[PDB]
Design a protein around this nucleic acid. Structure first.
Lengths: 716, 255
RNA sequence: AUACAGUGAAACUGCGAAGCUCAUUAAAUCAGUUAUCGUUUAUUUGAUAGUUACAUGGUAUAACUGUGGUAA
RNA sequence: AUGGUAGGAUAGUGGCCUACCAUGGUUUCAACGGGUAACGGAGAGGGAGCCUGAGAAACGGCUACCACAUCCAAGGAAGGCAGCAGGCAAUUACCCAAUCCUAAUUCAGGGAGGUAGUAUAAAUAACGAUACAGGGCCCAUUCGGGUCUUGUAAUUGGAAUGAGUACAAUGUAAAUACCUUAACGAGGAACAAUUGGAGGGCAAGUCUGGUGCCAG
């Protein structure tokens, strides 16, 4: 009987009281044996908490299996052999025995998005990814516990080196894994993070070093209970508003009800929120309000009907609140298409008058001439031209996610609002439904993944004016320094992330891994003239792709896992079967991002031009110590350029971008026939040859592409 | 006055004692519950003849206090702090099938047994006035007998304490959901469904008392090294400055 | 034991695996006895086959070694 | 259905079945049918079908069908428990030794089998000594009559042994039990069996009705 450190019981009790989540980092081989105790401490603090446990793993289970009869078949075998007593069963087995644990692979993180779990346990530290972190942490409820199991010796050695001195980073014998090192340092910054050993000793490196037990016991709930009580008599508002968990979406539901009452067909309601804030519940409740009000032809459109399952479920809950009964008042029709997995397509409602709710593909806008209401969910994933066609002479409800799933850049939503400026009504949901507002872990998850970063207008630029294109000079960015978690580096890092996200269409969370760990990628920043943290104006992310990556690939195949792929060499190979092009060393501009406000003055073109000179040689160890930090930015002259033959780009074909690349001396070589479903644009690969290198091959490819293009104008 | 079933431990070698029959008379006088006798320390007997004779005398005397033919269990010894499985298994079937008669006292008043104990008084009040100050307390458990009225202010007695008034009442979900209830949210009980909930007792390896919790239980050098770290990681960041450029000054904090 | 030779897990071969609960049925159940020149029959027992070879093949694999999939 | 010829199948005879042919066979000497103290033959969730072997249409396995129902990551997997034993509650523990058997067999095994577990005769007492007192008993409605070694609610002595407390051996596959057998073991022999009935009598006690001191 040891007394556990008082810090751990205080943090768990505090977070339960304030409805905030908590993170625990358990280091040790016996780490699994503490999860039962930590799990028991939850119910003792508060019994109402959800008892279901999420647990993610990569391939294998730590010391056991996820099938029952095998466990019982084994346990029978030890008992009969005599190794174990007839009735002996350890606490770790007991924790798995009685609790509802959902066994999930890292790859299949899409399945766990909807469900709510009291606790999430993460098996493997090395295989962690931002999507697997953003997805899993968001599924934890207020007062929940997050646990990450750093059992590996190499992780144990890595923790030692940073704590002894933050400067030195442990590095094994091409992946650098800087983000995982960031994950460790950031975990220290979190105030509600405790890192502990298998003996329940609180290791001091944690931020939660002074977490004191709060006195026994929210204003948000008071503003909600009063609203529900006031509206109880007013059906159908009272029953539907009762389903609201939070103040803001209750206002959104009321705003939707106002739009339904106004009956104006030229009205536009835009619902913008982060993931997990309850848009679908608001939309589903709002749809149920329209049924009770009297709207007959209700439409719903989304990229796939499968995503609408959560919406249609919450419509039925609204129907239950409104007194509607299945098979008497309404009927549910499921899809016969195997691709949709029996997703609900249509709901026929017979009360008072025949009303219909039906799913439609976004492309099928011609049917909308009779539509009284279309609900467009996840409009960020639908092409801009298509959603324009969906804006007909009828009431429209739109839910667009800012930083949910792939979603879209924030500026793309802003461009959509500018177009609407048809009457526009805007609704924003800021406060989450799952935990206390301002939870440290969400604040913490955002800074690590930089999801909530926002571009800021720079006043000093206005006072001095926009710099002329010639004046600025391109700077190389040292990745190790940018990925050190220093406040200057973080704030510098955020600024690229803002420019990174705002400019182009789609941005997945896992990209931050790709810039960080992969060696072939290099970051270039078009900083203003030096005369304060420099503010980026254009950022270019380029990947070395060709024979140079081959040494890295051969090492990867030696490990037994092929890492990444050479996009452009493969496309050119399957298209022209040119052995030379694969051998030729080249660079692909993965992304070029410019500030939307300062677009069209030429920031992007000059950065390409400066980039072109750098690899042409016209301008002719910073690694962190491996178990004081080098400069954050490196000038072009300070770092030798690598010998390259061509510069390549891959982008969705648009007139603006095509003109931009056409002006930068890039030549088209290929255009994809099948449109990218999310954008409807055709991917195009364009190449530019540097001086001093052979250019005959590009000419031959250009001739073929035109004749290919010429005959293929007709097909697609 | 509250035990629906009672397990009566009788030392077979020694025989009956005062503390046994007095409970029977108290139980006889406040409403006889279901009474089950369990005989122990029978392995101490050296002869089978005296064991059987002792068993006969004890069982007949237990039939005087409790209805003739009353069920009396016999336990020989203890191994690893455990009785023989079969006799321990035999009593399982009896207790499972017991039906309990309606008692006048129990079926007319509400009562509930404290599963856990918690003091809700603010620590500041304990200091500014002193420990002497009266304490706000919350007591948890399952309700028995007639329903307890929802409105606060109900008068209730606590044995050995005095009469108090219910300041607040609220229902919580079940800490030990019964199998038919848990799965709801001729077939044998599934072993997953079997559950044990004991707040004050040590279940598994963890025991909680007051606000302190107690549990039973190159890398080793590194762990002691990490545990001995003094400066916080956030504090260590304050000292670290970064060069924005190769020849630029080290920038510590962004303004 | 310079082919192995004691004991021997696993695997391939060989042998043997042939109380209860419901319904009810008059010499159609059962008992005695006859015949099988009208039949099959492991096993036990007695008899019984003169009609490259100083020893052929994998046309062969288990156990076994090692790589993996699966909630199983 | 009775029979002949020929064929099919069985391990073989045979309407057992198949093709043709004859219209036959039992019976008032009881055919056929009915009842019965004719406990005085069937299946293993329900029908259909297959497989092995000398011997089974197998309490074995396999296919489809009809229902039951379990686990799951909902993609699939698997079951015969649709059982057994109880109540209106402990069927367990020890063995192949004894009689027998299956096998590559002396030796392995058998919940075949065996072992154990949970109305009939005794005891609560027998034998003396002393002291102190004259009443003890029987019949009779009546009055009374008949008869003599008695009473103790007194003291006291030395012997006997059972239930129990139990050392052993024997008994047995081993063990329990049985039989035999060292030491201890009684005066309140408190080492303290009950059940039922018939009568009393007592207070500065209580109640009720009266013709005191009475009556209930």
């Amino acid at each position: 009987k040891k007394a556990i450190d008082s810090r751990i019981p205080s943090l768990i009790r505090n977070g339960v009281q304030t409805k905030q989540r908590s993170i625990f980092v358990i280091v040790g081989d016996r780490a699994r044996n503490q999860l039962p105790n930590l799990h028991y401490l939850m119910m003792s603090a508060d019994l109402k908490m959800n008892k279901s446990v999420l647990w993610a793993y990569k391939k294998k289970l730590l010391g056991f299996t996820s099938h029952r009869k095998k466990r019982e078949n084994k346990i029978k075998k030890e008992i009969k052999r005599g190794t174990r007593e007839v009735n002996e069963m350890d606490p770790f087995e007991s924790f798995i025995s009685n609790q509802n644990i959902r066994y999930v692979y890292y790859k299949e993180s899409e399945k766990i998005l909807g469900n709510t779990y009291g606790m999430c346990i993460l098996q493997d530290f090395e295989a962690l990814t931002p999507n697997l972190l953003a997805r899993t942490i968001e599924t934890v409820e207020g007062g929940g516990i997050v646990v990450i199991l750093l059992k590996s010796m190499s992780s144990l050695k890595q923790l030692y080196t940073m704590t002894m001195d933050v400067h030195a980073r442990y590095r094994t014998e091409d992946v650098v894994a800087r983000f995982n090192e960031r994950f460790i340092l950031s975990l220290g910054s979190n105030p509600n993070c405790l890192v502990v050993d298998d003996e329940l000793n609180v290791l001091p490196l944690s931020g939660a070093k002074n977490v004191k037990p709060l006195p026994p016991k929210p204003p948000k709930q008071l503003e909600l209970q009063e609203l529900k009580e006031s509206l109880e008599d007013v059906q159908p508002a009272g029953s539907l508003v009762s389903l609201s968990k939070t103040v803001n979406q209750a206002h959104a539901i009321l705003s939707f009800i106002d739009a339904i009452s106004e009956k104006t067909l030229n009205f536009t309601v835009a619902l913008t929120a982060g993931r997990g804030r309850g848009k679908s519940a608001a939309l589903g409740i709002s749809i149920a309000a329209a049924v009770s009000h009297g709207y007959s032809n209700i439409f719903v459109t989304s990229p796939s009907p499968e995503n609408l399952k959560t919406l249609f479920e919450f419509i039925f809950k609204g129907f239950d609140a409104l007194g509607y009964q299945e098979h008497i008042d309404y009927d549910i029709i499921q899809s016969t298409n195997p691709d949709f997995n029996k997703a609900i397509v249509r709901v026929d409602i017979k009360r008072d008058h025949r009303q219909t709710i039906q799913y439609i593909v976004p492309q099928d806008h011609q049917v909308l001439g009779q539509a009284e209401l279309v609900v467009i969910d996840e409009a960020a994933a639908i092409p801009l031209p298509i959603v324009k066609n969906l804006l007909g002479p009828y009431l429209v409800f739109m839910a667009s996610t800012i930083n949910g799933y792939e979603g879209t850049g924030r500026s793309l939503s802003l461009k959509l609002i500018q177009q609407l400026r048809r009457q526009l009504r805007e609704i924003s949901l800021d406060e989450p439904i799952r935990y206390a507002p301002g939870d440290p872990i969400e604040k913490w998850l955002n800074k690590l993944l930089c999801l909530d970063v926002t571009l800021i207008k720079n006043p000093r630029f206005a006072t001095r004016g926009t710099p002329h294109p010639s004046q600025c000079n391109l700077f190389v960015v040292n990745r190790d320094t940018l990925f050190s978690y220093h406040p200057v580096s973080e704030n510098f890092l955020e600024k690229m992330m803002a420019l990174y996200v705002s400019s182009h269409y789609k941005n997945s969370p896992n990209d931050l891994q790709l810039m960080s760990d992969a060696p072939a990628h290099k970051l270039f920043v078009l900083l203003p003239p030096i005369d304060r943290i420099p503010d980026p104006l254009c950022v270019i992310q380029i990947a070395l792709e060709g024979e140079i990556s081959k040494e890295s690939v051969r090492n990867s195949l030696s490990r037994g896992q092929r890492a990444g792929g050479d996009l452009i060499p493969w496309l050119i190979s399957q298209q022209f079967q040119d052995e030379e092009f694969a051998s030729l060393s080249g660079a692909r501009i993965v992304r070029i991002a410019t500030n939307p406000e300062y677009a069209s003055m030429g920031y992007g073109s000059r950065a390409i031009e400066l980039l072109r000179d750098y690899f042409e040689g016209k301008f002719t160890d910073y690694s962190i110590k491996r178990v004081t930090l080098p400069p954050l930015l490196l000038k072009l002259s300070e770092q030798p350029p690598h010998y390259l033959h061509y510069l390549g780009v891959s982008y969705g074909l648009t007139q603006s971008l095509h003109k931009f690349w056409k002006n930068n001396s890039f030549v088209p070589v290929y255009l994809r026939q099948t449109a990218n479903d999310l954008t409807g644009e055709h991917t195009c690969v364009m190449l530019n040859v540097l001086e001093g290198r052979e250019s005959n091959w590009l000419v031959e490819f250009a001739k073929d592409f035109r004749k290919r293009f010429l005959s293929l104008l007709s097909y697609d | 006055k509250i035990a629906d079933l009672v397990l009566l431990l009788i030392d077979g070698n020694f025989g009956f004692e005062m503390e046994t029959m007095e409970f029977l008379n108290i139980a006889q006088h406040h409403g006889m519950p279901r009474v089950l006798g369990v005989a122990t320390h029978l392995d101490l007997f050296k002869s089978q003849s005296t064991l059987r004779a002792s068993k006969k005398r004890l069982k007949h005397r237990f039939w005087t206090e409790v209805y003739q033919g009353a069920k009396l269990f016999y336990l020989s010894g203890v191994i690893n702090g455990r009785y023989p499985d079969r006799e321990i298994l035999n009593l399982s079937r009896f207790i499972s099938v017991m039906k309990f008669r309606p008692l006048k006292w129990r079926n007319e008043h509400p009562y509930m047994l404290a599963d856990r104990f918690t003091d809700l008084t603010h620590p500041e009040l304990i200091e500014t006035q002193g420990l002497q100050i009266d304490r706000k307390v919350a007591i948890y458990g399952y309700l028995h007998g007639t329903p307890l009225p929802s409105a606060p202010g109900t008068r209730v007695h606590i044995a050995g304490v005095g009469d108090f008034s219910v300041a607040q009442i609220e229902k919580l979900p079940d800490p030990c959901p019964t199998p038919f209830y848990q799965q709801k949210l001729r077939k044998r009980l599934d072993d997953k469904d079997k559950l044990i909930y004991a707040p004050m007792s040590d279940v598994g390896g963890v025991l909680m008392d007051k606000d302190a919790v107690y549990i039973d239980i190159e890398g080793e050098k590194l762990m002691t090294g990490l545990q001995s770290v003094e400066q916080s990681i956030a504090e260590k960041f304050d000292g670290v400055g970064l060069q924005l450029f190769s020849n630029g000054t080290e920038l510590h904090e962004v303004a």
